[PDB]
PDB file of C-alpha atoms and ligand atoms in Angstrom:
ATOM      1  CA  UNK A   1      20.158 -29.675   6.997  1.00 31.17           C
ATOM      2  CA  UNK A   2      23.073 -27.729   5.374  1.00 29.14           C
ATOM      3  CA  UNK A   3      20.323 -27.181   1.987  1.00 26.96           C
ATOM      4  CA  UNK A   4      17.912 -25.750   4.527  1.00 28.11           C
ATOM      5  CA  UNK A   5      20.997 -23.426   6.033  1.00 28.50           C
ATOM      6  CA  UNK A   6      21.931 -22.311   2.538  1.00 25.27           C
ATOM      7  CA  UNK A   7      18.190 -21.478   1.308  1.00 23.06           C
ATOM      8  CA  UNK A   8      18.356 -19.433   5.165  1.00 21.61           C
ATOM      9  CA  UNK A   9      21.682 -17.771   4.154  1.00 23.10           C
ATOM     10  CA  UNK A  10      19.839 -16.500   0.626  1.00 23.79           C
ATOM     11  CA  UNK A  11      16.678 -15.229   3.282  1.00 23.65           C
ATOM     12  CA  UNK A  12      18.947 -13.324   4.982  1.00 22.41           C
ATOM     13  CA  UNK A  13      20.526 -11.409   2.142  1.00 17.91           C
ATOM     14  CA  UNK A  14      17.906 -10.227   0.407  1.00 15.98           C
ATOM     15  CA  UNK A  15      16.614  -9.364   4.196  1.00 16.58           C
ATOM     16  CA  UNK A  16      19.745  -7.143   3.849  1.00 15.83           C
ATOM     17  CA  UNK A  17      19.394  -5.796   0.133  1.00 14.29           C
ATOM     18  CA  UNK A  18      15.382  -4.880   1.014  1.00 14.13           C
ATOM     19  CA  UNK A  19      16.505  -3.001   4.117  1.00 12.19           C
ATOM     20  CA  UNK A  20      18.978  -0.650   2.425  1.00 10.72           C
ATOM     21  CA  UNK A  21      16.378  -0.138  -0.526  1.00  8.33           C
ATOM     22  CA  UNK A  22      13.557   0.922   2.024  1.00 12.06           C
ATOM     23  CA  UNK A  23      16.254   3.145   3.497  1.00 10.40           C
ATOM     24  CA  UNK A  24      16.468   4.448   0.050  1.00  6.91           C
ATOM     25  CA  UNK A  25      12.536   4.540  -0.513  1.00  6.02           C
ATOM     26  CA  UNK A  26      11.837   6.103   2.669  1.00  7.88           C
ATOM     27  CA  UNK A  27      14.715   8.963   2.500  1.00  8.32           C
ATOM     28  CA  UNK A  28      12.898  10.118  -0.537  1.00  6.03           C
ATOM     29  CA  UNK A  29       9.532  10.659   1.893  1.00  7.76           C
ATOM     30  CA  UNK A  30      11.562  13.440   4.032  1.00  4.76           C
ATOM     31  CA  UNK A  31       8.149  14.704   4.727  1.00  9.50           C
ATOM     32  CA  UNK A  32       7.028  11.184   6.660  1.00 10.30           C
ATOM     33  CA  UNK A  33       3.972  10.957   4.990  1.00 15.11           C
ATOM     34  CA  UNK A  34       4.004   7.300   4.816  1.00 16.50           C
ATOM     35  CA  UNK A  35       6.181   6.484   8.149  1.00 14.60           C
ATOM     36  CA  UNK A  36       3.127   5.200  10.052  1.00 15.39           C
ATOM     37  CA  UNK A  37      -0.013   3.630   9.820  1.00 14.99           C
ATOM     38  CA  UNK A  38      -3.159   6.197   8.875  1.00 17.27           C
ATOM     39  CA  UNK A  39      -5.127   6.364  12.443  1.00 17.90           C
ATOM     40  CA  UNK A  40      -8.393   4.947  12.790  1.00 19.64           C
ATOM     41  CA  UNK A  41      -8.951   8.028  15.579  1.00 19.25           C
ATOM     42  CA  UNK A  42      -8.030  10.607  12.968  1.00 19.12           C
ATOM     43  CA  UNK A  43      -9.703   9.120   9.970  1.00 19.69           C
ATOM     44  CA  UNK A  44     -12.646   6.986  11.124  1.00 21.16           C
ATOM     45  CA  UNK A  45     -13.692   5.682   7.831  1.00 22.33           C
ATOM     46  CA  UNK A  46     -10.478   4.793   6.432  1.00 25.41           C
ATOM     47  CA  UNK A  47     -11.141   0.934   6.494  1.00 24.88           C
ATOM     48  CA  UNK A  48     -14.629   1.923   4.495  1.00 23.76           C
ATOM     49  CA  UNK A  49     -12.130   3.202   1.884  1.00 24.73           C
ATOM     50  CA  UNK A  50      -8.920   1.053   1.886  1.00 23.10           C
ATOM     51  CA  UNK A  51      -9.510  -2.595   2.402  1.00 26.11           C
ATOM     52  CA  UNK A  52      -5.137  -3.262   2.748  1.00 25.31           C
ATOM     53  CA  UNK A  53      -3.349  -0.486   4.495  1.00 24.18           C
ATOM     54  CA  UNK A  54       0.106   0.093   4.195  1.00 23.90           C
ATOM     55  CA  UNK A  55       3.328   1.965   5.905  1.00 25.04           C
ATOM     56  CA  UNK A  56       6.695   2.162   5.830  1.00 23.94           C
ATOM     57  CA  UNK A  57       6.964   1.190   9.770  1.00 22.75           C
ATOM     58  CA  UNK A  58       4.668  -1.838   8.986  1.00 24.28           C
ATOM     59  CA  UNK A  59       7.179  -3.285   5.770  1.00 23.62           C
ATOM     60  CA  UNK A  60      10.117  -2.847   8.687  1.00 27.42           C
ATOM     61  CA  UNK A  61       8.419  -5.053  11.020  1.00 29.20           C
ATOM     62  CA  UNK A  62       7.860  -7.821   8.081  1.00 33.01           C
ATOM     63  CA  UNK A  63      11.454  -7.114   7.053  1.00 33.52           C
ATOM     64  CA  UNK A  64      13.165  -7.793  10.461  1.00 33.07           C
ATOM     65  CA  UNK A  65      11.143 -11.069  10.731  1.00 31.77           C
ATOM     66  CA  UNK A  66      12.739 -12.075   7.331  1.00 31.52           C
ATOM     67  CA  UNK A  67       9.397 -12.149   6.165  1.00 30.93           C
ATOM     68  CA  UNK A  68       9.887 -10.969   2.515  1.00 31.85           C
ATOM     69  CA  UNK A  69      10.607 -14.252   0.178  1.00 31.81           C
ATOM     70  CA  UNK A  70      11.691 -11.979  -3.060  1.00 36.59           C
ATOM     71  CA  UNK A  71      11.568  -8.392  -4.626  1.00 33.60           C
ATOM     72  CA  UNK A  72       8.190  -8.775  -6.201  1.00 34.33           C
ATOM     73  CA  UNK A  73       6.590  -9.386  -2.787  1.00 33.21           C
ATOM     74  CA  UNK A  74       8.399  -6.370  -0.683  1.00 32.85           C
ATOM     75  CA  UNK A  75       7.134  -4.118  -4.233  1.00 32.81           C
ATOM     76  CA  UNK A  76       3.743  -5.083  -3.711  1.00 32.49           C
ATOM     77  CA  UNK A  77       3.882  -3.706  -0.699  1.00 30.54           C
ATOM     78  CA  UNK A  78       5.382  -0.255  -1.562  1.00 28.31           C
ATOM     79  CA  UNK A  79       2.712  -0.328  -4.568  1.00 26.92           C
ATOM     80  CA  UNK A  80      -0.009  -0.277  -1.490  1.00 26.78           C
ATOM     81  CA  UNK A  81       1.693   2.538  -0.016  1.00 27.57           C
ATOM     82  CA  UNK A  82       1.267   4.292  -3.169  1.00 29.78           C
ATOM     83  CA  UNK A  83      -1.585   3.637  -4.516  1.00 30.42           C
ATOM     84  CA  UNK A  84      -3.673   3.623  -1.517  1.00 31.33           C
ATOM     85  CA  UNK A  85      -2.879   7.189  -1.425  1.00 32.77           C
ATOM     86  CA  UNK A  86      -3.884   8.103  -4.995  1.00 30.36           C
ATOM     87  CA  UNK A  87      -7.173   6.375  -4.557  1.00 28.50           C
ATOM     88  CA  UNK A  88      -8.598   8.442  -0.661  1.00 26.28           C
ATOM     89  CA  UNK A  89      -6.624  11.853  -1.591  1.00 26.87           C
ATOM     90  CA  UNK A  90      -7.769  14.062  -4.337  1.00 28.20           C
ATOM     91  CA  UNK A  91      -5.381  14.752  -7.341  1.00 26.70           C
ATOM     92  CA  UNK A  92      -4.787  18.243  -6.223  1.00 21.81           C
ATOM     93  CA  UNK A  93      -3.760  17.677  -2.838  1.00 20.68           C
ATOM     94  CA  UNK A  94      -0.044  17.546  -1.023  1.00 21.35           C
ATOM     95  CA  UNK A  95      -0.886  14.211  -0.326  1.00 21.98           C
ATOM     96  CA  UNK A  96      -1.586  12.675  -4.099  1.00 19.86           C
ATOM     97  CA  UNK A  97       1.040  14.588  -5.089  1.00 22.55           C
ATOM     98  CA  UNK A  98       3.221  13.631  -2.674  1.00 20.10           C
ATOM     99  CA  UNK A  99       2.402   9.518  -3.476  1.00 18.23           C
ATOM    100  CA  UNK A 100       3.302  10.601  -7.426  1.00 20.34           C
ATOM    101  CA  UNK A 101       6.575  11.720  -6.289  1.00 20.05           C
ATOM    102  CA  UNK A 102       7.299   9.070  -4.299  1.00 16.77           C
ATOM    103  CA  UNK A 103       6.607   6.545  -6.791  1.00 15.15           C
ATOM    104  CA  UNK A 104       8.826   8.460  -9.346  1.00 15.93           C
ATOM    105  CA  UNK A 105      11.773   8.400  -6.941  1.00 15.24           C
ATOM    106  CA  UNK A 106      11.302   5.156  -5.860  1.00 15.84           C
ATOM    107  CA  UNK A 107      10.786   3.564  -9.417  1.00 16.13           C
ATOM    108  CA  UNK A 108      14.740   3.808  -9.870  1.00 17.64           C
ATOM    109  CA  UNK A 109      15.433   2.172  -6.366  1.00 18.11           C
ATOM    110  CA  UNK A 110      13.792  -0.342  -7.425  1.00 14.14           C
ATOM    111  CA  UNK A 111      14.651  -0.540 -11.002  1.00 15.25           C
ATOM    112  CA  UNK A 112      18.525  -1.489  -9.698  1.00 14.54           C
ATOM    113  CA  UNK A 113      17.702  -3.391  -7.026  1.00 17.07           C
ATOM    114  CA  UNK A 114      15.720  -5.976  -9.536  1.00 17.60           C
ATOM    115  CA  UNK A 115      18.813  -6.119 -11.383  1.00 17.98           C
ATOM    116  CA  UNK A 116      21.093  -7.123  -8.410  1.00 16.05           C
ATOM    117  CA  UNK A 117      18.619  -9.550  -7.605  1.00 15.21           C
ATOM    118  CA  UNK A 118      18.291 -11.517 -10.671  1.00 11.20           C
ATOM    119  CA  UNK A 119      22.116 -10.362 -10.872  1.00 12.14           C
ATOM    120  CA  UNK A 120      23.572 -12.140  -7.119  1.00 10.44           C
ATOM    121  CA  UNK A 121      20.662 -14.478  -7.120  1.00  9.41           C
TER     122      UNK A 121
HETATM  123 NA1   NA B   1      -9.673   9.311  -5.327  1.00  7.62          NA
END
């Protein structure tokens, strides 16, 4: 159906807004702190900590199978980025500190992006 094609055209470009902001998100982690996954090998308890891991190579996958239906959803993931960081690493480490950052920078990525999607529809 030409609704269903429409609805599929919308999919596809906020698929294409969401990749340029985690372009955006990620250039601000020039470190790669959050590129990959956190290894089970080099962290064995990890899952006894952090029941929904998150990464920046994991949102790309989801993103390239269109599988982000709006902004709030793609967020929530970021948010797990973040915030599963503040809650294993210690306030005084490079790592905490380098989740604060991150979420400082990113908050004003995001804070346009929400505008130009309530703004294009
Ligand atoms: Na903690």
């Amino acid at each position: 159906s030409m609704e269903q094609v429409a609805m599929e055209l919308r999919l596809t470009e906020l698929t294409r807004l969401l990749r340029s902001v985690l372009d955006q998100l990620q250039d601000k982690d020039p470190a790669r702190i959050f590129a990959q996954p956190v290894s089970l090998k080099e962290v064995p308890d990890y899952l006894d900590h952090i029941k929904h891991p998150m990464d920046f190579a994991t949102m790309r996958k989801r993103l390239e199978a269109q599988g982000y239906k709006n902004l709030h959803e793609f967020e929530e993931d970021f948010d797990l980025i973040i915030d599963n960081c503040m809650k294993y690493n210690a306030r005084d480490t490079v790592f905490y500190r380098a989740a604060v950052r991150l979420r400082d920078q990113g908050g004003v990525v995001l804070r346009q992006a929400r505008r130009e999607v309530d703004s294009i529809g």
